[PDB]
Amino acid sequence: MEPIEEATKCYDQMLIVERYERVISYLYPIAQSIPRKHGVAREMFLKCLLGQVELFIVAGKSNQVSKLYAADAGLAMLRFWLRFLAGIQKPHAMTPHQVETAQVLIAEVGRILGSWIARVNR
């Protein structure tokens, strides 16, 4: 059947997105739980959470390491959003466990991204 082959098949991009889809699969439900108010913060968190996939994907389909650091900056920005939803949002948005849990998932994507950046930098 030879699976449909996209052009520019980057494992690091495929692996990092599959692993970052776990961050989304975890953070998106609790992004959606952020109440009516805090909706701009949720919209911006969701554009940082869901929009990080595009950062990874564009980084994979690129011979530019610049796209890979932009993916790292977005993952760093997603780590801020965890600090924001927990420690700045009013009701709570993200419980410290949900934070602790997401910080584990984002660290997995950060570990793949750091190896990805290192592999390309060499």
Binding site: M1, E2, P3, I4, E5, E6, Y11, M14, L15, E18
Partner: protein, 328 residues
């Protein structure tokens, strides 16, 4: 059910079953190049795989044959995600119509029966019946001796579907000896194949206190002579019928421990195999002298579960004496 089974490639290629096969094939392989290249257009790849199966045009991708050498050199041939998916699609409809006929005392690659259910059956069936002796056999190269011809006299005594039989004969050609070890279709067919000696223990030979894990076969008894006769009868059959040579065998008294499935199993206690102990010991050690002491806690908690059944403490003390870290 009632024998026959003459329309299986309809179920094998159902989208609800191929989705199960897709899920099963991806389970744990979601960091591999196979899944990530497949996951891209997964349901479109499932559509061209369904229409390759349902149409009769599935050709199994070539085994990439490496030799893993870890416990012993084994020519482990891996398969593409598309091929491991088709095997999962087969062994979702074909497996439970073989694993249904497997006597209950076969504990390999079956739902609800495993490495542990075996060590508990040997040991339980050691306590009850109060077995005085036991026969433990093992088939030489089991997977690289399964006849792949007499096997397709058991896979063709239950499939009956002229199309599933051909999907099974694209996964595993019905030619010469050699079922690829490292395939889902293969564990089943090997369990099915080894199930022939189960029926020669349980049906013929009227041995009721036994246990087979794939190729390992424990047969508790009461005379070390009846168990030796059972083995001779078992060996003569598995050789003249199945072409499986017996590597090791022993009719020992229940005292020498039944080395079954990583547990030396007495009726009363049940330790671990020293190999598993030493492998984990050196693995923790290599991990130590490589630079990981936080994933070790994850492994230790894992292996503390595999060893909670065994009466271990013959490693946790050792490892507390080598590094001081608090295991338990």
């Amino acid at each position: 059910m009632g024998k026959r089974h003459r329309n299986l490639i309809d179920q094998i290629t159902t989208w609800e079953n191929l989705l199960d096969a897709y899920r099963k094939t991806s389970h744990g392989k979601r960091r591999t190049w196979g899944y990530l290249e497949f996951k891209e257009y997964d349901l479109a790849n499932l559509l061209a795989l369904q229409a390759e199966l349902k149409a009769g045009n599935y050709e199994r991708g070539p085994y990439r044959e490496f030799l893993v050498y870890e416990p012993k050199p084994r020519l482990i041939s891996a398969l593409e995600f598309k091929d491991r998916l088709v095997q999962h699609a087969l062994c979702n409809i074909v497996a439970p119509i073989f694993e249904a006929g497997l006597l209950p005392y076969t504990y390999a690659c079956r739902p609800d029966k495993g490495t542990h259910a075996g060590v508990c059956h040997v040991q339980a069936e050691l306590r009850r019946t109060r077995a005085t002796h036991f026969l433990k056999s093992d088939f030489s190269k089991f997977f690289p001796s399964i006849d792949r011809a007499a096997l397709y006299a058991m896979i063709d005594k239950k499939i009956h579907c002229a199309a599933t039989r051909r999907l099974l004969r694209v996964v595993l050609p019905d030619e010469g000896v050699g079922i690829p070890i490292g395939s889902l279709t293969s564990q089943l067919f090997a369990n099915v194949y080894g199930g022939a000696v189960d029926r020669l223990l349980h049906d013929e030979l009227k041995q009721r206190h036994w246990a087979r894990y794939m190729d390992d076969i424990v047969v508790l008894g009461d005379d070390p002579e009846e168990l030796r006769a059972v083995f001779y009868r078992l060996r003569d059959f598995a050789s003249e019928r199945l072409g499986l040579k017996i590597s090791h065998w022993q009719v020992a008294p229940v005292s020498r421990g039944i080395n079954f499935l990583g547990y030396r199993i007495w009726p009363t206690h049940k330790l671990l195999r020293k190999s598993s102990v030493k492998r984990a010991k050196r693995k923790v050690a290599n991990f130590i002298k490589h630079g990981e002491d936080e994933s070790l806690q994850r492994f230790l908690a894992s292996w503390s579960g595999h060893a909670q059944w065994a009466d271990t403490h013959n490693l946790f003390t050792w490892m507390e004496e080598q590094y001081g870290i608090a295991c338990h």
